[PDB]
Amino acid sequence: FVIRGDEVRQIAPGQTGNIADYNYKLPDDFTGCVIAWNSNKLDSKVSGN
């Protein structure tokens, strides 16, 4: 999924935040990796996306 760079830290087990609480919530006991990279070139049109 795609989110802004302000909430890249919200994707974490048991972390508060609008995105974490309402869109995608990680389990408290989570084992795995999170990979986040900028998508300004790929997913930002001149008019807007």
């Binding site: 974490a12 087990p13 048991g14 972390q15 508060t16 408290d28 006991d29």
Partner: protein
């Protein structure tokens, strides 16, 4: 002259008193109350607290 019985009773009482008082020890944690750690702290290290 009933030193022994009184001593035994006092020893049991003070052992129980030490046991009941020991839970107020912080043990280096942020707080000594469980629900505070479970609610106002993130699970990833609230679990180790």
């Amino acid at each position: 002259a009933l030193g022994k019985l009184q001593d035994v009773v006092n020893h049991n009482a003070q052992a129980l008193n030490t046991l009941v008082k020991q839970l107020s020890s912080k043990f280096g944690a942020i707080s000594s109350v469980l629900n505070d750690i479970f609610s106002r702290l993130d699970p990833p290290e609230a679990e180790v607290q």
